[PDB]
Each structure stands twice: as structure tokens, then as C-alpha cells.
Amino acid sequence: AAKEVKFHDSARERLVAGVNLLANAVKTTLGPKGRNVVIERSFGAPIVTKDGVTVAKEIELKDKFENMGAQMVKEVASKTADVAGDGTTTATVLAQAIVREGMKYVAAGMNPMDLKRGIDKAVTAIVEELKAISKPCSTTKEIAQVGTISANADSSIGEIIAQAMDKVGKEGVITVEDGKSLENELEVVEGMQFDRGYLSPYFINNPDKQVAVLDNPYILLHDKKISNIRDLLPVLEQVAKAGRPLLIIAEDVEGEALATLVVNNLRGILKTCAVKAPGFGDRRKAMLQDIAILTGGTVISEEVGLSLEKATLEDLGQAKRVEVAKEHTTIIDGAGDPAKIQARVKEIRVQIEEATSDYDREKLQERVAKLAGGVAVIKVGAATEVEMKEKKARVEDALHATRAAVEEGIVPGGGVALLRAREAAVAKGLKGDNPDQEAGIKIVLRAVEQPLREIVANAGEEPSVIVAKVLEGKGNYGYNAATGEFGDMIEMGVLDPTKVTRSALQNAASVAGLMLTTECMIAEAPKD
């Protein structure tokens, strides 16, 4: 429809007002002494959150020109959440600091394109200094400290995450679900479990658990439905001769085939259990192949030339124990050759880099976890689901930060890392080509102080005095906003993932630099 066009300061003033409104709301949640933000939901039960990205995504302004500024800052938080899962409040605070400091130079008449080029030059220098300052996260104590800090000083969340990563290793998958009790509990699933139950209660061999337990069983992988007994009889006779139990993993076992199994179970002639093949579509085939590789067998399929009638014991997978519950079954550990298992894991991890869908690599990682790792479930305990949603966001934030810690390392928290990186970059000789680029560098140098300033401001102290004292110190020296005292940030456990710090600065600079270079602003005009 009709468009309203704003120029020069009338457009920048509207843009900055939208930037400030969104960032001020996100500001309140920053730091250990940051406070919660309540966001109304259409379906009732307002959410309480301390996450910057959650607050940013819910902000829309009636003024369309102000809304444009808010939408661009919302991009900073959204990108930081996507790439790091943490630091969205820090990224939003940094973006507002760059805009606030950059608009002073834009009003001073300097070329904003050179300011943006100077901003990029300074951010590149500071990010390189962050890499040098960063230290690897090797000890599980550091993992707990990183998780504790990112969970808003919750030691229980940090400890349970450190235990989860210890149990499932680096290749494991950790998820967060609602708990039933009031306390956090960690459930670790070892081996391969594909969450499929038996097709008949008569497969159960012990009533105290209602779980079909098979000791040293054969595993039959089939990619087609099984209904008649004629084709399944030849393999049944072989496993009957051996005496070992048989686990039939196929799309479905019904009619004569299912009936025959339950008869042999009741009379004790042959113990067996049947489960549905996990997953739908091609994912069902992929996990079926993984089970065959893990169990040392081959999936029987006419697409590969194998037939159920001609299937032999060598084509069947093996294990020492599998237990089938009402809705899940776990192969404790397959009998396949570990070299082939490692090769299969290598193939998936190579293909992981090519994954595009967000659910794609998530489902590919659980396959790797099922193969050569474990799956940990952290069940969050809370009295009410409004507290459960708040705690789950904190647990998920701590999981993202701890994952980023093992990837790129850790740096001192409380905004100290940006200050230390800034001083190193300046000492190295950071400079611009023209005075406008030098001003752009000075924008970033002042802006990196903002995360510490807003942390201190939320704590109720004077940001300028604290920042000056921190700059006087060297190394990991910093300010603990939780206790209001200075000290070695690493010793007091205030740790930040360097990936989160680097991502927050890079995302903030890219968007805030563009917002400095705006002269005209076009939005749809109001409906009178």
C-alpha cells in the first residue's frame, strides 16, 4: 500500500528508539542479578523468562519505523541463539552499545560506511584476541562451572549436566524433558534403544517387570511386513535348533506369523519377541542398517538379494541381552565388529556436515549416540509448569553453553573477556585507514565495555567505577556481580564459552554496523 518515507535524523531517531526499546527490555535479564521478564501468551499462562532471545522475539511496536529498528536487533538475538544458544542478551546489549556510540559519530558528520568498515576491522582484531585468551575446557569441574553460570548460578543444574556429559561422552546426546518430581533427575540410556514395544503381551518372560528379556538372542532385521508363517518358518527352525531367543525387527508381524510366535512362547517350545521396525520412511531403513551393523548381522531384504526363506544364522544379528518393554526395547550392546561400527559412525558424521534441516542432524546425532555413545535425559523438577518452563530454558541454556565450551574453549566471564581482548587488540596496533574508520574502531572499543556495565548496573553498583577497576587489573581479574567483589574470574567460577562471546560480538557488529549506515527508511503508512 502507501509508503511513508523518513530521511536523515528523523529516520535514525525512529530507528534508534526501536533499538533502545527492545534492548532495554532485554537489558533487565542480563547478569546474575538480572531479573525475569513476563510475556503474555494468547492461550493464557504467561511465560517467565530470563533469556534475551525469548524477550526479543516477542517485541513488536505500533510505530512501524520504530518496529524496523526492533526487528533488526531481534536478528542479533536470533542469530546468536541459532549459532551458540547463549549470549543473546549480551549480543543485544552489544548491538545497542554500537548503535548508541555510532550514532554520535554519524551525527558528527563522519561517513557511516567507513564507520562500518572500522567496526568490522576492530571486531576482527578483538575476535582474534579472544582466541588467544581462550583456554580449553578439559576438566569436568569447568563443565559444571560453565553450566552453573549459564543456568543463573544454579549449581544443581551445572552438576547434573557435567554428570550427563561424563556418562555419554562427547558423542552422546543430552535432552531436556519435564519431570514428575520436584527434583532434577538424570536418566542415561546406554547402548541402542529405538523406543518400540512388543506386539503381544505374551512375549513377556518375567511378570515383575512386564519386560521381555532375551539372553544371547538372535536379531532378525526385515524391511518388509511379515504376515504369513511359511516364509518365517525356515529361520525359526534354525534358531529353534540353536535354542537362543530370536528378536524379530520388522515393519509388522501379524496374522499367522504373530500367532505362531505366541504359541511357541506359551508352550515354551521357543522363546522369542517381535518389535516394529523403528522410524518411518528412509530413516527406518537407515536405523535398520545401523542395528544390523551393530549386531553383526545383515538386514534381510529382496532389494539387496537376500530372502527370508533363504536367511541363515550368519545373516542374523547377535547380542548378549535385549529387553523389550511396553513401548521401548534396548539392545544392551551389539555383537558387531567395532571397526565396522566406527566406520559407520564416521560415515554419519561425515554426512552430518551436509545436513540442512534442523531436525536432520539432530536425528543423525541420536543415531551416532545409539551406535557409539549414549542418550541422556535430564528431567527438570518443578512444582508448577511455569517454573518448569523457566527451569527448562535455564537447563537448555546451560546445555548449549557447555557444548560451546568443549568446542572452542572458555574465557573469563562477566564481560572481562571482551575487555581483555580489547586491550590486547589495541596493544597489537589496531588502526584504521582513515579517521572515519578510526572512529569506527573507537565505537567497538567503547561498546565491548557494555556487557560488564549492564551486569554491574543490574547488580546496583556504579558501572564506570567497576569497569575502570577491571581495566586496571590483568588476566582473569574481574568483578563478581553475585558477591560484589573483585578476584580471579576463573577461580570464582565465572566462566564463559569463548564461542558464545565471539558469536555475540560478531552478530551484534554485523547488524549494528548496518544500522549506522541508514539515511532513508521506508515503511507502510498508517491507515489514517
Ligand X SMILES: Nc1ncnc2c1ncn2[C@@H]1O[C@H](COP(=O)(O)OP(=O)(O)O)[C@@H](O)[C@H]1O
Q: Cβ of residue 394: shortest distance to ligand X, in angstroms?
A: 9
390 binding Mg ion? (CB under 5 A): no
Q: Cβ of residue 36: shortest distance to a second copy, in angstroms?
A: 5
- Residues numbered 453-472 forming contacts with ligand X, rule: CB under 6 A: 455
Q: Considering beta carbons, is residue 60 or 251 the nearer one to a second copy?
A: 60
437 binding Mg ion? (CB under 5 A): no
Whole-number Å distance between alpha carbons of 109 and 122: 20
Query: Among residues 202, 205, 333, 377, which is the contact residue for a second copy, using CB under 8 A?
Result: 202
232 binding a second copy? (CB under 8 A): no
Which x/- pattern over 311-350 shows residues binding ligand X (rule: CB under 6 A)?
A: ----------------------------------------
88 binding ligand X? (CB under 6 A): yes
86 binding Mg ion? (CB under 5 A): yes
| Number of amino acids touching ligand X (CB under 6 A) | 21
- 496 makes contact, choosing from a second copy, ligand X, Mg ion, none, with CB < 5 to 8 Å by partner type, with ligand X
- 266 makes contact, choosing from a second copy, ligand X, Mg ion, none, with CB < 5 to 8 Å by partner type, with a second copy
- Residues numbered 273-312 forming contacts with a second copy, rule: CB under 8 A: 302-305
- Residues numbered 72-101 forming contacts with a second copy, rule: CB under 8 A: 72, 74-76, 79
Q: Considering beta carbons, is residue 222 or 453 the nearer one to ligand X?
A: 453
Which amino acid type is present at position 227? S
Per-residue b/e over 368-387, b at no fewer than 16 CB within 10 Å?
bbbbbbbbbbbbbbbeeeee
What is the radius of gyration, based on Cα positions, of the chain? Answer: 29
- Residues numbered 146-185 forming contacts with Mg ion, rule: CB under 5 A: 150
384 labelled ligand-binding: no
Strands 192-193 and 329-331 come out as: antiparallel
| Number of amino acids touching a second copy (CB under 8 A) | 101
Label residue 321 left, alpha or beta by phi (over 0 means left) and psi (-120 to 50 means alpha). Answer: beta
Which x/- pattern over 432-461 shows residues binding a second copy (rule: CB under 8 A)?
A: ----------------------------x-
Q: Considering beta carbons, is residue 38 or 242 the nearer one to a second copy?
A: 38
Q: Considering beta carbons, is residue 151 or 165 the nearer one to Mg ion?
A: 151
Q: Which three cell numbers stand for residue 496?
A: 564463559
268 binding a second copy? (CB under 8 A): no
Residues 56, 58, 64, 66, CA torsion sign: negative
Which amino acid type is present at position 338? P
Q: How far is CA 13 from the centre of its chain?
A: 37
Angle, CA 219 vertex, CA 214 and CA 223 arms, to 5°: 135
102 binding ligand X? (CB under 6 A): no
Contact status, residue 215 vs residue 206, Cβ threshold 8 Å: no
Q: Cβ of residue 54: shortest distance to Mg ion, in angstroms?
A: 12
Q: Which three cell numbers stand for residue 369?
A: 549416540
Could you tell me which residues come within 8 angstroms of residue 429 by beta carbon, excluding any fewer than 6 positions away? none
- CA neighbours closer than 13 Å in the CB half-sphere of residue 45: 8
31 labelled ligand-binding: yes
- Residues numbered 137-166 forming contacts with ligand X, rule: CB under 6 A: 149
Whole-number Å distance between alpha carbons of 70 and 59: 7
Whole-number Å distance between alpha carbons of 477 and 404: 23
90 labelled ligand-binding: yes
Q: Cβ of residue 68: shortest distance to a second copy, in angstroms?
A: 5
30 labelled ligand-binding: yes
If one counts every other C-beta atom within 10 angstroms of the C-beta of residue 283, the result is: 14
- 30 makes contact, choosing from a second copy, ligand X, Mg ion, none, with CB < 5 to 8 Å by partner type, with ligand X
Whole-number Å distance between alpha carbons of 408 and 118: 26
For 402-418, the three-class secondary structure string (H helix, E strand, C coil) is: HHHHHHHCEEECCCHHH
Could you tell me which residues come within 8 angstroms of residue 368 by beta carbon, excluding any fewer than 6 positions away? 171, 345, 348, 349, 352
507 binding ligand X? (CB under 6 A): no
Q: Cβ of residue 124: shortest distance to a second copy, in angstroms?
A: 9
Q: Cβ of residue 24: shortest distance to ligand X, in angstroms?
A: 14
Query: Among residues 66, 86, 436, 449, which is the contact residue for ligand X, using CB under 6 A?
Result: 86
298 labelled ligand-binding: no
28 binding a second copy? (CB under 8 A): yes
Q: Cβ of residue 156: shortest distance to a second copy, in angstroms?
A: 11
Task: Compute the CA torsion angle 162, 167, 170, 174 (nearest 10 deg).
Answer: -70
Whole-number Å distance between alpha carbons of 49 and 519: 35
Which x/- pattern over 387-416 shows residues binding a second copy (rule: CB under 8 A)?
A: x--x--------------------------
Whole-number Å distance between alpha carbons of 272 and 285: 23
Q: Cβ of residue 198: shortest distance to a second copy, in angstroms?
A: 13
Q: Which three cell numbers stand for residue 298?
A: 545383515
Q: Which stretches of 172-237 are assigned E, i.e. beta strand?
A: 173-178, 185-190, 192-193, 212-215, 218-221
Instruction: List, as one string, the DSSP characters of 95-144.
Output: HHHHHHHHHHHHHTT--HHHHHHHHHHHHHHHHHHHHHH-B---SHHHHH
- 455 makes contact, choosing from Mg ion, ligand X, a second copy, none, with CB < 5 to 8 Å by partner type, with ligand X
480 labelled ligand-binding: yes
Q: Which residues bind ligand X (CB under 6 A)?
A: 29-32, 34, 50, 52, 86-90, 149, 413-414, 455, 480-482, 494, 496
Q: Which residues bind Mg ion (CB under 5 A)?
A: 86, 150
Q: Which residues are annotated as a binding site for Mg(2+)?
A: 86
Q: Which residues are annotated as a binding site for ATP?
A: 29-32, 50, 86-90, 414, 480-482, 496
